[PDB]
Amino acid sequence: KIHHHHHHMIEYRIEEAVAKYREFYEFKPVRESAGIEDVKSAIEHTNLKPFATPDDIKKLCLEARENRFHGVCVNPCYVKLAREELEGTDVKVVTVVGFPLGANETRTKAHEAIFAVESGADEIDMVINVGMLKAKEWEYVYEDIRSVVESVKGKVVKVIIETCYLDTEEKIAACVISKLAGAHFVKTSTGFGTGGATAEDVHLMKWIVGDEMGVKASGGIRTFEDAVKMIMYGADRIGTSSGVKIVQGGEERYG
Amino acid sequence: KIHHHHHHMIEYRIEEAVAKYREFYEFKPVRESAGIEDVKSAIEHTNLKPFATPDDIKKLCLEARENRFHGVCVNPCYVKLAREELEGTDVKVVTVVGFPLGANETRTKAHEAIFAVESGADEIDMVINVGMLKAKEWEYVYEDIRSVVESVKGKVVKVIIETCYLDTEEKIAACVISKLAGAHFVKTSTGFGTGGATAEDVHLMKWIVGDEMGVKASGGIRTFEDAVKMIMYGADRIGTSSGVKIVQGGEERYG
């Protein structure tokens, strides 16, 4: 009865955001174009490939050091290695929880988050349970995020909503629930779905969640132009494995 | 002592398998044909889509009952539901561990496997750490599988080797290691990589693992003829989401 009451309260908060979006939303940029240093500061330089080797992670970390990226993002098995490689730098170690499908038991996601932080993760990017969101099981989706957030209280949790599988209302619902569960960021995509970041999705998400929560744009971000566009429409972070070519394109075409 | 020496013993076993493969291997069928009843009994009727809803899982389970499939395969968040839906039937509930990327900490995989069995799973399809396998970290890969096998003693564990990312010596290594670690099956694919089951892969794996270990062919198996081919070349189980069309396909064209 408490959880059905909370389900009801969540539904009302979603409806209020949907109503406001319908009456007031306008798609427009949040800022003028970003520079090279802004782009570097946004980048979480990523290798989440299942075939990544320890030497690949060593190379990723070196690249993050060389280009002064905000952080690296690696699979959980490589968190201690990235921490070791990055010891003494301010480069953050980000890993992924319940990734990329988001369809693990909640307690698995919570355990994985705890293990990640024990291994030296600074931030967690989790995947939402997309199927249960689409089924309008708001309380399940809320408790699933909440359990991770609580389990690593004090550490940054980002919620990947996986926009490629969502309609507009569901995008809004995912953002509202993520905010209510006490997550610090929402994130567009895993890069393992049918689509990645769009300016439209980034802007909507930033408009719903506000200035106090972050938006991380990821999936398909290949160039300096892609990075600048996502930042221009409200992204605070960029997830990409193309950090090096992004910096090179910026230097070549915009330097 | 234990780890460096286990590393060494595994390398020698892999070398022995590779030597035998080079000396004696022949690609050819293991049986003349398979009929509709054999195919039904091989099929693990699957929905691992991240956007799968409770209703989709209810439909999958109904389809498994109507067609007398061996099992259903679902993500861990739905094991309890599948079990509830299949109560009073002998349809197995299979789930996936460390799936599809295989790059979780070993302890996350082992906990996920335990949590699945507690939630009612009969069998576990885990994903190998592909990157550590490619880096020839045999003891890491071995312990990763061994930890899961032992955590769910008495339940079938299948190791997904993810053939699409592997060369021939790597496929042999993954099979040798899965065998050594006490897994009951090797499985071709996740369906989330760059390729799925081939007859050449199924047959190589069966030849390496032998008569008392299983091979589960998965990924890209869309038709009855696809299903029959894999069985002819050594598959004991078939992972597919196309179970209903596979069966209707064979009934129509073969009786």
Nearest-CB residue to A105 (from B115, B130, B193): B115
**Parallel, antiparallel or unpaired: strands B43-47 and B71-74:** parallel
Instruction: State the catalytic residues of B.
Output: 125, 187, 216
Q: Which residues of A touch B192 (CB under 8 A)?
A: 100, 192
Q: Taking CB atoms and an 8 Å limit, are B51 and A130 in contact across chains? A: yes
- Determine the Cα–Cα distance for residues B123 and B213; give it in Å rounded to an integer: 14
C-alpha separations of B216 from B160, B193, B202, B203, B229 in Å: 9, 16, 8, 11, 13
Nearest-CB residue to A75 (from B54, B55, B101): B101
C-alpha separations of B147 from A116, A117, A248, B108, B160 in Å: 18, 21, 44, 10, 15
Closest chain A C-alpha to B52 CA, distance in angstroms: 5
Q: Are B239 and B217 in contact (CB under 8 A)?
A: yes
Q: Residue A169, SS3?
A: helix
Q: At the topology level of CATH, where does B1-255 sit?
A: TIM Barrel (3.20.20)
3-state helix, strand, coil in chain B (%, to 5): 55, 15, 30
Closest chain B C-alpha to A252 CA, distance in angstroms: 33
- Surface-to-core class of residue A251, CB atoms within 10 Å of its CB (0-12 exposed, 13-18 middle, 19+ buried): exposed
Q: Taking CB atoms and an 8 Å limit, are B112 and A105 in contact across chains? A: yes
Q: Which residues of B touch A52 (CB under 8 A)?
A: 103, 131
Q: Residue B217, SS3?
A: strand
- Determine the Cα–Cα distance for residues B130 and B137; give it in Å rounded to an integer: 10
C-alpha separations of B63 from B82, B119, B255 in Å: 12, 22, 19
Residue A50 DSSP code: T
Phi and psi dihedrals of A221, rounded to 5? -85, 100
Closest chain B C-alpha to A186 CA, distance in angstroms: 18
- For B10-49, b/e burial (b = at least 16 CB within 10 A) is beebbeebbeebeeeeeeeebeeebebebbbbbbbbbbbb
**Which of A73, A92, A69, A46 is CA-nearest to residue A222?**
A46
Name, in order, each residue with C-beta under 8 angstroms of B85's C-beta and a sequence gap of 6 or more: B57, B58, B61, B62
**Parallel, antiparallel or unpaired: strands A71-74 and B92-97:** unpaired
Q: Taking CB atoms and an 8 Å limit, are B76 and A108 in contact across chains? A: yes
C-alpha separations of A207 from A24, A26, A157 in Å: 10, 9, 19
Closest chain A C-alpha to B189 CA, distance in angstroms: 13
Is A187 tagged catalytic?
yes
- Determine the Cα–Cα distance for residues A198 and A218; give it in Å rounded to an integer: 9
**Which of B177, B172, B135 is CA-nearest to residue B159?**
B177
Every domain of chain A and the residues it spans: 1-255
Is A216 tagged catalytic?
yes
Instruction: Please name the residue of chain B whose CA is at the shortest distance from the CA of residue A95.
Output: B104
**Which of A3, A13, A18, A16 is CA-nearest to residue A139?**
A3
- Determine the Cα–Cα distance for residues B54 and A63; give it in Å rounded to an integer: 43
Residues of B with CB under 8 A from a CB of A: 48-56, 75-79, 99-108, 111-112, 115-116, 119, 127, 129-132, 134-135, 137, 162, 165, 192-193
- Determine the Cα–Cα distance for residues B93 and B79; give it in Å rounded to an integer: 7
The angstrom resolution of this structure is 1.8
Q: Which residues of A touch B99 (CB under 8 A)?
A: 101
